[PDB]
Amino acid sequence: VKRFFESYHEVPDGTQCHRKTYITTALGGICGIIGSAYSVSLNPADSTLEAVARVGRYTFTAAAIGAMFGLTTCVSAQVREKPDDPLNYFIGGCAGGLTLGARTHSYGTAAMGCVYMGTAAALFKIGKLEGWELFPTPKV
Template identity: 50%
Template sequence: MGYWDLEEGKDCVEKTWITTKIGTALGLVGSAYHLVAFQPDSALQAVQTAAKGTITMASLGAIFGMATCLSAQARNAPDDPLNYFIGGCAAGVFLGARRHSAMTGASACVGLGTVAMFTKLRAERAVDGFGSLLTEVNPVLMGPLRGDKGRRVKRERGDRRRCGLREVQVSVTQLGLGYESEETLVFRYCSGRCLRHRRTYDLALDSIQSAGLLKEPAPHVPCCRPLHYEEDFSFLGNNNQYYTIPELSAQDCGCV
């Protein structure tokens, strides 16, 4: 399971483990390039240099993963990109402390935090388009000025974006199925995004379609659809006859 497949604000240990592995891999690659560019005098020095760089990058990954997840939990705003800025900033502060330089820590805090935040925004924009990027950036920048109300509105909007069960009260006539009746019902439907459920197939199809290689458009994002339906709905029509509609309201939802 990949990093983006895990729910934000949960599975902190798993998320931290993934970011630690990514940091370790980057550290190994960076150390290899460093050893090629600046050949050490001895094998021991080479091992020390590689270990130092790899451990530093692994620590940065671990701090970023844990700080991001804990921020999402503490602020009760799991989808807020600001959590990623906080995680990146925490990693930058650690880097400055390791090098005993306040200037390095401040620069790394802003730099890594900004990169992490826009990485999160880019992941969300993959589905929603550029418009959602502007929508997300504005709350991130204005959030500290708007206070608790702004954070609450943003959290509620994030909840609505997830694939889940919604409901609305309508009359039978408003269903548009050809029946005439004044009876009302609570119609439950599925709505929301399925970004975290994209698979390799979806990513490949998106790239192929963007390159103009398909003759006709094809959906490359999972859809939020009912997994099961409620019991058949029966009602009395305006002509005093009873009717039954099967599979009308959703019982639960999922990304398919």
């Protein structure tokens, strides 16, 4: 089910690389699938083969970004013992941004993606640690 995704937080970060990398690759692939769906819907391709090619490009790029993010985060948290430190997620986000920039063949996109994705991943780690909740229910 969807608990496959929530399995990401079982073992402390820095362990079960392969598994966390699989999870993040799945997340990236899903995001790329949705983005390709919207791009094909609005802004239609000239041919069905071209549309399928664009879907493949988007999905592969997003999956690669997610896989790199997960692998780099785990490898950092393992090489340095820090098992729950946002800098690991910042490094992973920068690696994902660099992957995006490389796949797009753009140094500016590489750098901006590194910075933005690293900040986003660090904030996600901080939120998981400190107990923030995206989409809180009305408590008042």
